[PDB]
Amino acid sequence: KKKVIIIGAGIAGLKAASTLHQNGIQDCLVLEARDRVGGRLQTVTGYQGRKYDIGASWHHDTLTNPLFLEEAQLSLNDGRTRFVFDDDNFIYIDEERGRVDHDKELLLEIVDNEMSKFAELEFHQHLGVSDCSFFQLVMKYLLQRRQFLTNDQIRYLPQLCRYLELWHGLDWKLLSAKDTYFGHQGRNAFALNYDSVVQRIAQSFPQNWLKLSCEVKSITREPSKNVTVNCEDGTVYNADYVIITVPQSVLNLSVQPEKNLRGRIEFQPPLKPVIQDAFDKIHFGALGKVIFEFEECCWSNESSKIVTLANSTNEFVEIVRNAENLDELDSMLERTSVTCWSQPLFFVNLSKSTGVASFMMLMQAPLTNHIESIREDKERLFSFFQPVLNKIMKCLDSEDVIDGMRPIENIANANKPVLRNIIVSNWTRDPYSRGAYSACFPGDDPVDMVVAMSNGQDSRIRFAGEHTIMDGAGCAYGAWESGRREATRISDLLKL
Amino acid sequence: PAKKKVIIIGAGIAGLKAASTLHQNGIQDCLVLEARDRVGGRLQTVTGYQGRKYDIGASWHHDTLTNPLFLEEAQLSLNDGRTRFVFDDDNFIYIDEERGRVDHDKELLLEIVDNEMSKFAELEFHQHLGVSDCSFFQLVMKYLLQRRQFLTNDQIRYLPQLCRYLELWHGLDWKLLSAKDTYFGHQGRNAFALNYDSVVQRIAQSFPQNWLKLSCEVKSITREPSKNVTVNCEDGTVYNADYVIITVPQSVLNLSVQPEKNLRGRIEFQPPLKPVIQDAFDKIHFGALGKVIFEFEECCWSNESSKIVTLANSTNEFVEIVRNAENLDELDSMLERTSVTCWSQPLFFVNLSKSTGVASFMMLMQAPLTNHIESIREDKERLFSFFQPVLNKIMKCLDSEDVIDGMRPIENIANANKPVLRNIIVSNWTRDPYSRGAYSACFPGDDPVDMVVAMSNGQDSRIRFAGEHTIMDGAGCAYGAWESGRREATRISDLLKLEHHH
Numbered sequence: 001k002k003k004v005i006i007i008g009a010g011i012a013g014l015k016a017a018s019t020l021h022q023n024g025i026q027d028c029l030v031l032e033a034r035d036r037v038g039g040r041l042q043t044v045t046g047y048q049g050r051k052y053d054i055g056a057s058w059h060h061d062t063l064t065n066p067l068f069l070e071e072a073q074l075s076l077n078d079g080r081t082r083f084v085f086d087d088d089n090f091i092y093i094d095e096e097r098g099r100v101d102h103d104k105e106l107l108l109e110i111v112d113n114e115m116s117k118f119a120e121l122e123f124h125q126h127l128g129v130s131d132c133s134f135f136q137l138v139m140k141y142l143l144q145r146r147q148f149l150t151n152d153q154i155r156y157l158p159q160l161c162r163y164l165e166l167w168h169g170l171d172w173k174l175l176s177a178k179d180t181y182f183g184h185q186g187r188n189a190f191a192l193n194y195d196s197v198v199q200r201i202a203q204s205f206p207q208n209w210l211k212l213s214c215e216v217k218s219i220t221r222e223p224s225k226n227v228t229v230n231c232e233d234g235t236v237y238n239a240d241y242v243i244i245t246v247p248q249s250v251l252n253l254s255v256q257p258e259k260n261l262r263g264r265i266e267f268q269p270p271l272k273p274v275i276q277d278a279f280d281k282i283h284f285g286a287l288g289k290v291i292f293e294f295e296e297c298c299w300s301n302e303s304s305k306i307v308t309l310a311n312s313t314n315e316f317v318e319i320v321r322n323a324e325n326l327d328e329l330d331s332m333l334e335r336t337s338v339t340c341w342s343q344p345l346f347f348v349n350l351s352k353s354t355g356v357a358s359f360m361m362l363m364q365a366p367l368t369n370h371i372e373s374i375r376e377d378k379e380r381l382f383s384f385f386q387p388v389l390n391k392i393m394k395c396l397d398s399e400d401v402i403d404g405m406r407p408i409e410n411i412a413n414a415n416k417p418v419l420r421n422i423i424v425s426n427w428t429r430d431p432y433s434r435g436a437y438s439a440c441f442p443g444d445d446p447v448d449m450v451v452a453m454s455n456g457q458d459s460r461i462r463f464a465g466e467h468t469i470m471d472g473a474g475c476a477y478g479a480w481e482s483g484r485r486e487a488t489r490i491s492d493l494l495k496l
Numbered sequence: 497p498a499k500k501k502v503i504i505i506g507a508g509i510a511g512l513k514a515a516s517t518l519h520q521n522g523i524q525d526c527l528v529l530e531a532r533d534r535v536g537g538r539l540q541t542v543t544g545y546q547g548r549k550y551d552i553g554a555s556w557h558h559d560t561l562t563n564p565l566f567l568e569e570a571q572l573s574l575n576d577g578r579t580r581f582v583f584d585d586d587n588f589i590y591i592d593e594e595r596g597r598v599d600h601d602k603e604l605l606l607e608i609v610d611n612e613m614s615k616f617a618e619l620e621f622h623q624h625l626g627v628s629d630c631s632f633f634q635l636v637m638k639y640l641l642q643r644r645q646f647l648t649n650d651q652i653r654y655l656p657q658l659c660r661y662l663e664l665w666h667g668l669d670w671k672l673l674s675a676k677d678t679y680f681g682h683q684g685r686n687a688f689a690l691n692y693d694s695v696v697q698r699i700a701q702s703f704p705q706n707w708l709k710l711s712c713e714v715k716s717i718t719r720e721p722s723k724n725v726t727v728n729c730e731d732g733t734v735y736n737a738d739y740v741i742i743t744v745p746q747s748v749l750n751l752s753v754q755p756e757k758n759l760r761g762r763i764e765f766q767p768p769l770k771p772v773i774q775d776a777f778d779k780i781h782f783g784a785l786g787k788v789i790f791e792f793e794e795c796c797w798s799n800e801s802s803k804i805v806t807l808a809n810s811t812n813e814f815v816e817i818v819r820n821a822e823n824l825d826e827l828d829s830m831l832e833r834t835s836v837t838c839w840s841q842p843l844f845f846v847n848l849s850k851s852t853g854v855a856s857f858m859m860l861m862q863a864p865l866t867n868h869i870e871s872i873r874e875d876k877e878r879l880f881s882f883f884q885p886v887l888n889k890i891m892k893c894l895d896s897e898d899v900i901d902g903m904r905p906i907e908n909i910a911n912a913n914k915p916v917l918r919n920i921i922v923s924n925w926t927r928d929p930y931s932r933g934a935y936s937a938c939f940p941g942d943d944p945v946d947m948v949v950a951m952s953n954g955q956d957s958r959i960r961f962a963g964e965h966t967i968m969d970g971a972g973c974a975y976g977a978w979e980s981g982r983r984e985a986t987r988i989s990d991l992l993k994l995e996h997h998h
C-alpha cells in the first residue's frame with residue numbers, strides 16, 4: 001500500500017511529509033487524530049477576528065533556529081512581517097508593593113543575575129548527584145548569600161525569579177534546578193501566526209496524503225518487512241516505513257496496560273526496553289495559556305512583558321535570617337486555598353508588540369490543569385483573574401477592568417478597560433497532547449529519551465517530535481528538525 | 497650576606513599575603529624587599545579634597561560568590577559590624593552626547609541586544625581551539641552584519657557604542673582587545689572596598705615588621721648552582737635565601753628578557769628566565785585601566801545610580817554603511833575616513849555620592865587614552881577642559897547644571913544647585929616604573945594560560961613567581977594576586993617543615 005505512513009500531523013509529521021515529497025517519494029500518508037493539522041501549533045480566533053497562538057508562540061534561540069532562519073529568509077524576500085522581536089524590560093508587579101522592576105533600592109534583576117550564576121556554578125563541573133527542585137536551589141542561594149542581601153531582596157527576589165516556571169510550565173518545586181537554567185541562543189521572536197508556518201509546510205505535499213480525524217490504535221512489524229498500521233475506524237495500512245510523531249506523553253501510554261486510553265498505540269513487538277526506560281528520566285510539563293481580550297487599549301504600552309509576583313511575607317525573611325542550615329530552613333517553612341496571587345503569572349501585553357488590545361497570559365502546573373478544567377466558565381475565570389488584572393491596569397496607568405463579556409455597554413468607559421472575551425487552552429485535557437511539551441523533574445536527563453527515540457524501534461518504526469532530538473528539545477523547531485531527520489533517512493533508503 | 501629562609505620581592509598583595517602565610521605557618525627569617533617607599537603595589541589609597549580617600553588602584557572585589565579574599569573580608573565584617581565593603585552594582589545609566597540617556601529605553605532596548613551580542617560571542621567560541629581570535633571591535637561588526645535584519649537603525653547606531661564599556665573591564669580599546677577574552681564571566685556581584693588599604697595594612701601587620709624593607713629595589717637574582725638563591729638590592733646589600741618569590745608585575749618582569757641593564761625595576765636573572773618563561777611574554781600583554789577622580793563640593797545631582805557610562809559619539813552614516821555592505825571584508829573597508837576628545841571613547845563613571853556619600857565621581861578610562869591623560873595629570877586645567885563636556889552632559893542627564901571650575905578656590909555663595917569641581921586626582925600607573933600599566937589583558941591572539949603555567953611552575957625549585965599575572969582564578973584581580981602569594985608560600989612552608997629535622 002504505502003511507502004511511508006506518518007503518524008501525527010504536528011510540525012514534525014508535516015515537515016516529514018514535506019521532506020518526503022521534496023525528495024520525490026510518493027504514496028505516503030499522514031494520519032492525524034485531531035480534525036486539524038498543526039498539533040501543538042494552534043492559532044485560535046477570538047473577539048473581532050483577533051488571532052492567537054494558544055499553542056507554541058515564539059521562535060526561541062533565534063541566532064541558530066533553522067526554522068526561524070527559513071522564516072526570516074522569506075521575510076527578507078517579500079518584506080511582510082512574520083514575527084516580531086518582543087523581548088522587553090519585564091515589568092514586575094507585587095500585589096502590595098506594585099512595580100518592583102528596575103528599582104533603585106531593590107535591584108532585583110541584579111541579584112537575580114547573581115543567583116543564575118550561582119546556579120551555573122552549583123552544577124557545572126561538580127555534579128555530585130546534585131539536582132534539586134528549582135525551589136530548593138533558590139533556598140540554597142538565599143542561605144549562602146543572606147549576609148549580602150537586603151530583607152526586601154530576600155522577600156521579593158525568590159518570587160521574581162519564579163518567572164522561570166513559565167519557561168517549562170512547572171511550579172518551582174517540580175522543576176529541575178538543573179533544567180531551570182539553560183542558555184538561550186539569542187532573542188525570542190514572537191510568531192505572527194505560527195499557523196502560517198503550519199500552512200506553509202502542510203500545503204507543500206499532496207493533500208491526498210493527509211487523512212484527518214483518524215486516531216491510530218496499533219502498529220505491528222510483521223517480521224516479513226512491512227509495518228501494519230491500524231486506524232481506529234478499522235482501516236488498516238501496509239507501510240514500508242512509519243514515522244511516529246505522537247507526543248512524548250502520548251507514547252508513554254504505550255508502556256502501560258489497559259489500552260482504552262485514547263491516543264495510545266499498541267506495539268507488537270512492544271517498544272523495546274531501551275525505549276521504555278527513558279520515560280523514567282524525562283517527563284511532561286503543563287504550560288497553559290489564557291487570552292484576555294479587551295475592546296481597546298487604555299493602558300500604558302511601556303512593555304510587552306509583565307510578570308505578577310506571588311504573595312511574599314515578612315516572616316519568610318525572618319525564617320531565612322534564622323535557619324542554621326538548609327534542613328532547618330526547609331522544615332521551618334512548614335506553615336490555604338488558591339488564588340491568582342498564589343503563583344507567578346506571565347502576561348504578554350500584545351498592544352505594544354502587535355498592536356492588539358489583548359493580554360497573553362502564561363500559567364503552569366499545578367494551576368494550569370485547574371484553570372483548564374473550568375475553561376468554559378468564563379465568569380469564574382473573570383473572578384479568579386480579576387485581582388491581578390486590576391493590579392496590572394493600575395500599575396499601567398489605567399483603572400479596574402469592566403466585565404463586558406455579554407452585551408450591554410454603558411458607553412462611559414473610554415478610559416476604563418473593558419474585557420470582551422477570555423480564551424483558555426486545553427492541552428492538559430486534550431488526550432492527544434496530555435500536557436505541554438517535554439520538561440524534566442529533578443533527576444531527569446532527556447539524553448536517554450533523545451537517543452532511544454532518535455535511533456528507532458527498528459529500521460521500519462521511526463520517531464520524530466519535540467521529545468526526540470537534542471537541539472531545540474521541546475521546541476517547535478526541534479520537532480521540525482526531527483521530522484526532516486527521519487524523512488531524509490527514509491528518502492535515501494527508498495530512493496533506489 | 498645574611499641568610500634568609502624566604503625572600504619576597506615586592507610588597508603588593510601577593511608579597512604581603514605570602515609573608516602572611518609564611519609567618520602563619522611558622523617560617524622565620526624571611527624578608528619582603530620592596531622598591532617603593534610604601535607597601536600595597538597596585539593597591540594604593542590616595543587622599544584629596546577635605547581628606548576624602550579614594551582607591552586609585554583596585555576598587556572592587558570581583559566574583560564575590562567565590563573570591564576567597566572577599567569571603568575573608570566578609571567573615572571579619574560578619575564578626576565585628578565593621579563596614580569593609582559595599583555592594584555597588586547598579587542599573588547602568590548610558591549617556592550619548594546628542595541623545596542623552598538611552599539606557600533601559602522602551603524603543604532602543606540596547607541592554608537586550610547587548611545580551612544577544614554576548615551569546616553571539618560565546619557561540620562563536622566553544623569546545624576548544626581552532627576557533628581563531630579577532631579584535632573585540634571586529635566581532636561587534638560581525639554581529640551587526642549577521643543580525644542587521646533583526647536590528648533597528650538606532651540599535652545598530654548605539655549598540656556598538658554601548659557595549660564598549662567592556663573596554664573598561666580590560667583597560668583596552670576595542671580594537672586592541674582580544675575578542676576571545678572579552679566576555680570573561682563574573683562570578684557574582686562586585687563589592688566596592690571601603691578603603692582597600694584596610695586590606696593592605698591588615699595583611700601587612702600579620703607578619704614580623706622587621707621583615708619589611710621598603711625602598712630597596714632588587715636588581716639581580718642569581719641562583720648559585722649549589723642550591724642557594726642570591727639576591728642583590730641596588731643599595732649594594734646582598735642576601736642568601738633558600739627560596740625567593742618574585743611578585744613584580746609581569747610588565748616589569750618582562751624587562752628582564754631584554755638587554756639594557758639600567759631600566760628602572762628590571763631584575764637581572766642568572767640563569768636567564770627559562771625559555772618557557774621568555775616565550776609566554778609573547779602570548780600576553782598589558783592593560784592600562786586608568787582612573788580620574790572628580791571631587792565636587794557637595795552632591796546637587798540625581799543619585800539614581802552609582803553607574804554611568806558615557807558613549808563615544810556615533811553617526812547614522814555608520815548605520816547606512818552597515819546596511820549597505822556585502823560581507824565583513826567590504827564592511828571593514830567602507831569604514832574608512834578628527835582629533836581625540838572626551839567623546840571619542842566610552843567613559844565609565846562611578847557616582848560615589850550614591851554608593852558612599854562622597855560628592856565625587858570615580859571615572860575609569862582605557863588605553864590609549866589613559867597614557868595621554870596620565871601624562872598630563874599635573875596640568876589640571878587642561879584636564880578640566882578635556883572632561884568638561886562629558887561632565888556637563890552627565891549633570892544635564894542627572895537634573896543638575898553645568899560644572900563650575902572651582903579648583904583654584906575663588907568662591908561663590910550663589911552655588912546651591914550648581915556643581916563645583918574642587919579637585920581632580922589622576923592615577924599614574926602607566927608612568928610609574930614599578931607598575932608600567934594596570935594589570936595585563938589580552939591582545940588579539942593572546943593565550944593568557946601560557947604565562948600562568950610558566951609562572952606557577954617556577955624558574956626552578958627555588959625561584960618562584962606570584963602576582964595577578966600568575967594564576968587562572970582571579971587573573972589580573974587583587975584576589976588572584978592574593979591567592980597566588982598564598983600558593984607559593986604554602987608550598988614553601990611544607991617543604992621547609994620537612995627540611996632536615998626541626
Ligand SMILES: Cc1cc2nc3c(=O)[nH]c(=O)nc-3n(C[C@H](O)[C@H](O)[C@H](O)COP(=O)(O)OP(=O)(O)OC[C@H]3O[C@@H](n4cnc5c(N)ncnc54)[C@H](O)[C@@H]3O)c2cc1C
Pocket residue numbers: 007008009010011012013031032033034037038039040041054055056057058059060214215216217245246247250262263264265287288289425427432433435436437464465466467474475476477479480
Ligand atoms: C502552551 C504551549 C506553548 C508553547 N510555546 C512554544 C514557544 O513559544 N516556542 C516553541 O518553540 N515551542 C513552544 N511550545 C512547544 C511546541 O508547541 C511543541 O514543541 C511542538 O508543537 C512539537 O510538536 P510535535 O510535532 O512533536 O507534536 P505535536 O505537534 O504535538 O503532535 C503530533 C500530532 O500527533 C497527533 N496524535 C497524537 N496521538 C495520535 C494518535 N493516536 N493517532 C494519530 N495522531 C495522533 C496529535 O494530535 C498531534 O497533532 C509550546 C507548547 C505549549 C503547550
Ligand SMILES: Cc1cc2nc3c(=O)[nH]c(=O)nc-3n(C[C@H](O)[C@H](O)[C@H](O)COP(=O)(O)OP(=O)(O)OC[C@H]3O[C@@H](n4cnc5c(N)ncnc54)[C@H](O)[C@@H]3O)c2cc1C
Pocket residue numbers: 505506507508509510511529530531532535536537538539552553554555556557558712713714715743744745748761762763785786787923925930931933934935962963964965972973974975977
Ligand atoms: C587602575 C586599576 C584598577 C584596578 N581595579 C581592580 C579592581 O577593582 N578589582 C581587582 O580585583 N583588581 C583590580 N586591579 C588589579 C589589582 O590592582 C592588581 O591585580 C594587584 O593589585 C596587583 O598585585 P600584585 O601583588 O600581583 O602586584 P603589585 O601590587 O604591583 O606588586 C608588585 C610590587 O613589586 C614592586 N617591584 C617591582 N619591581 C621591583 C623590583 N625590581 N624590586 C623590588 N620591588 C619591585 C612594586 O613596587 C610593587 O609593589 C586594578 C588595577 C589597576 C591598575
